[PDB]
Design a protein around this nucleic acid. Structure first.
Ligand SMILES: [Mg+2]
Ligand SMILES: [Mg+2]
Ligand SMILES: [Mg+2]
Ligand SMILES: [Mg+2]
Ligand SMILES: [Mg+2]
Ligand SMILES: [Mg+2]
Ligand SMILES: [Mg+2]
Ligand SMILES: [Mg+2]
Ligand SMILES: [Mg+2]
Ligand SMILES: [Mg+2]
Ligand SMILES: [Mg+2]
Ligand SMILES: [Mg+2]
Ligand SMILES: [Mg+2]
Ligand SMILES: [Mg+2]
Ligand SMILES: [Mg+2]
Lengths: 141, 59, 38, 207, 173
RNA sequence: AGGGAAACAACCCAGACCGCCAGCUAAGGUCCCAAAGUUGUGGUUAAGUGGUAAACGAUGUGGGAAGGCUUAGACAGCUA
RNA sequence: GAUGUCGGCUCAUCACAUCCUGGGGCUGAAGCCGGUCCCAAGGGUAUGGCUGUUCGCCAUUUAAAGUGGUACGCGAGCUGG
RNA sequence: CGCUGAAAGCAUCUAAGCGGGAAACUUGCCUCAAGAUGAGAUCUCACUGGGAACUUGAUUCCCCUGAAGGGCCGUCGAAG
């Protein structure tokens, strides 16, 4: 019978990603791939086996074309006519961390495994992170 | 699942699944996906010894 | 301005300019020849 | 900053000219400072404020030790005010001395609670007829939504229930008189809440 | 022909502190002019100046003409004083400059007190004449347009602040 | 029945006797949801075209063969 | 082997092809006023006589008395004209 | 509504760049708001005893201890 990973016997590593001009979508797909764990031979769809990801610059991210002044982010509050929108340029100045999180959130399963994988993503808008004890290793150099 | 595991094991060695199967088919190694995903996880040395020969096949 | 679907010159002083992706028409002699969209 | 007092009923005073000034008398005990939340340890900047007269048997040991860092011997309740920039020591006394004539202020406080109010009283709805053939429905709400394709009732719909004692603030009430001897504030207008309640007086930012 | 090919032939007193990416012109009668040119450019150093692009695209061909003219404007700014002659037309209109304050009377209830920016200094030889002296054409024109926008001209009377352009609209009915 | 067109008895591929944790293909795909090319070479397109739409309008841009004048001085502008 | 049809009252929600308020271009716009056309849905947008009437005509205002969708909204909320 | 400015020696509000700009947009005024499972943050208070089996973040059980405080109950409220 084929081997299946066990959550009690899983190995997970810490990585740090520097987004200082990286394309939003081409960075988010690598982050989501490494969060789901498609880079390991022992990948299982039913249990999570992935590596923690740390983003240190959530405001230097780059979007190509005229999407800086476009690409509205819609969402509804629940009340009638509660539709609200904000563009990339205004959102990246207000909440830089939520710009890149929503891209990865829409690129994971919509099951409770997706929520667990999303909790391993930890973005920061500054230049340093509070995970020096974990000692993440640089990748994508 | 076996295809996904073999692709993950091969990308760590420096190939892709589409090129790996072609390299295997340039010769006739004839190892199934069930017994390539098992070697990808447990027998990593044997999987690497298969992948290097697939690279040597130049395909 | 004069919103249309076919902007065109009306006198020798009309110059057609594409401003911010919109085909504008500006006339230095007759302000009535100014046309916005087309 | 602001001042915490008690509503004590409304009154009226007459000026020399002849006009009547409706007044709400606000009793203000001298207020002690309990904390001074600096920015380095708390983020924002604010100051705690407390009124007196609470018996020792009703204060927990945690609160007794909290009121022991600053020698306050504090009483009922603790209120906090956000301030721009002004230094305050651990033990200080805030009185009515910071107010003057005019000086439009904002007055908050828990309003008088109606038990469980209908739609005519809560939302000022209009009632149906009373004689022209009407059935039992005379004051009940009418329709809620459209027939087939809202598919539901929209959230935020105005319905009956609990005209409550929730916090409400009357904006920009001018002070008529300040008493530094009896510790009173005379505010021109109404104040939310019943007499003998708790009221917060702050300078008006709307101006 | 293409303006980018013509040289600049800077006058006597000019200094070129060219750092490759950031050019700077210093001279008498105003100084401290500098511009960060687009990256895709070539700038030589000699008695004159010439500009040339690297990639023959539809963008750099226009960038070369734009930057040559910008450098020419910077050179002329520290050699000749830019001016904008604005004249007031209408009864009861006057301008009274008080140093860095230019107060105008345009028939409004309150007197507008337009504050000039740094560098530009305006002078009023008459009550119906403004002379906006400066070092940068862009800032001089912007200040002149902002002063003009308070009361633009009227075709039935000409009653409004207007500059030397004599193509003002005119109609009577 | 199955696979594809996001879901879509009638459209495309293909007709399930049963079992396999075996391999090759069709339509349709190979960045992540999602299995498989961030594969190789020569170009175009910047508008999110792709990812709805006609009359008609426009010195948008790439390519093709013919033309009219021109160092005897053209086309622009500057002076009569 | 049942989806209760027109008006009225109560309660509203949504589109802008906008009636008022807001910012502008042109005008055969002297001024006061106007006509036409872009941007704009934040808030407002009448009481009566007649008629079952929606609509419509009237008298009197108001800055205005908008056009539509929502089973020509709303009868397990009311009337049965 | 513009200023500099070429492509296209002029002109040109735009291709780069620099401005003004309305009840719309985002702050500013008021209320709820860490079930914000990302569950945040400051001050203060309370607990400092042993034994056995079995396996070892060591688990389970016996006795002694029950503090900070909370609840029960009662007198009530311009709270319900
Ligand atoms: Mg779902
Ligand atoms: Mg614009
Ligand atoms: Mg009450
Ligand atoms: Mg009755
Ligand atoms: Mg019904
Ligand atoms: Mg539904
Ligand atoms: Mg195959
Ligand atoms: Mg895949
Ligand atoms: Mg039935
Ligand atoms: Mg519109
Ligand atoms: Mg607003
Ligand atoms: Mg109906
Ligand atoms: Mg009934
Ligand atoms: Mg907490
Ligand atoms: Mg005790």
């Amino acid at each position: 019978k084929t081997y299946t990973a066990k959550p009690e016997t899983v190995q997970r590593d810490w990585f740090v990603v520097d987004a200082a001009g990286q394309t939003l979508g081409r960075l988010a797909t690598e982050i989501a791939r490494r969060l789901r764990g498609k880079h390991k031979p022992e990948y299982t769809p039913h249990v999570d086996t992935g590596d923690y990801i740390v983003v240190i610059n959530a405001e230097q991210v780059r979007v190509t074309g005229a999407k800086t002044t476009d690409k509205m982010y819609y969402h509804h509050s629940g009340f009638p006519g509660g539709i609200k929108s904000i563009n990339f340029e205004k959102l990246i100045a207000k909440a830089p961390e939520r710009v890149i999180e929503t891209a990865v959130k829409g690129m994971l399963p919509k099951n409770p495994l997706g929520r667990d994988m999303y909790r391993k993503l930890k973005v920061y808008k500054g230049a340093s992170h509070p995970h020096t004890a974990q000692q993440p290793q640089e990748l994508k150099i | 699942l076996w295809i996904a595991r073999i692709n993950a094991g091969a990308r760590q060695n420096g190939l892709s699944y589409s090129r790996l199967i072609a390299g295997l088919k340039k010769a006739a190694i004839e190892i199934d996906r069930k017994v390539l995903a098992d070697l990808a996880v447990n027998e990593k040395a044997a999987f690497t010894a298969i992948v290097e020969k697939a690279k040597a096949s130049l395909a | 301005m004069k919103v249309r679907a076919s902007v065109k010159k009306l006198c020798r002083n009309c110059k057609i300019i594409r401003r911010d992706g919109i085909v504008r028409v500006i006339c230095s002699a007759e302000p009535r020849h100014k046309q916005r969209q087309g | 900053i602001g001042v915490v007092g008690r509503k004590c009923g409304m009154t009226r005073i007459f000026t020399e000219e002849g006009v009547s000034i409706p007044v709400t008398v606000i009793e203000v005990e001298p207020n002690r400072v309990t904390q001074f939340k600096t920015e380095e340890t708390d983020g924002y900047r604010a100051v705690q404020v407390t009124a007196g007269e609470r018996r020792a048997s009703r204060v927990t040991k945690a609160q007794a030790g909290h009121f022991a860092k600053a020698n306050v011997a504090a009483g009922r309740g603790v209120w906090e005010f956000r301030l721009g920039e002004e230094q305050y020591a651990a033990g200080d006394q805030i009185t009515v001395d910071l107010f003057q004539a005019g000086q439009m202020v904002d007055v908050t406080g828990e309003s008088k609670g109606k038990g469980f109010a209908g739609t005519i009283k809560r939302w000022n709805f209009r009632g149906q007829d009373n004689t022209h053939g009407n059935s039992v429905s005379h004051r009940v709400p009418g329709s809620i939504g459209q027939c087939q394709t809202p598919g539901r009732v929209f959230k935020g719909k105005k319905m009956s229930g609990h005209l409550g004692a929730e916090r409400v603030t009357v904006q920009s009430l001018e002070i008529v008189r300040v008493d530094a001897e009896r510790n009173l504030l005379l505010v021109k207008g109404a104040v939310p809440g019943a007499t003998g309640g708790d009221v917060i007086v702050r300078p008006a930012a709307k101006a | 022909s293409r303006v980018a090919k013509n040289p600049v032939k800077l006058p006597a007193g000019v200094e070129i502190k060219l750092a490759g990416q950031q050019l700077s012109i210093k001279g008498a009668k105003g100084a401290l002019e500098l511009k960060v040119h687009p990256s895709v450019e070539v700038i030589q150093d000699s008695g004159e100046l010439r500009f040339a692009a690297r990639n023959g695209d539809q963008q750099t061909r226009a960038m070369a003409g734009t930057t040559r003219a910008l450098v020419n404007n910077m050179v002329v700014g520290v050699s000749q004083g830019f001016e904008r002659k604005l004249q007031l037309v209408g009864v009861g209109y006057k301008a009274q400059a008080k140093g860095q304050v230019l107060s105008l009377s345009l028939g409004f209830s309150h007197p507008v007190d337009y504050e000039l920016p740094a560098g530009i200094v305006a002078e009023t030889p008459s009550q119906t004449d403004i002379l906006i002296k400066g070092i940068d054409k862009q800032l001089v024109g912007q200040v002149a347009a902002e002063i003009r926008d308070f009361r633009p001209p009227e075709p039935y009377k000409g009653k409004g602040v207007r500059y030397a352009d004599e193509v003002v609209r005119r109609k009577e009915a």
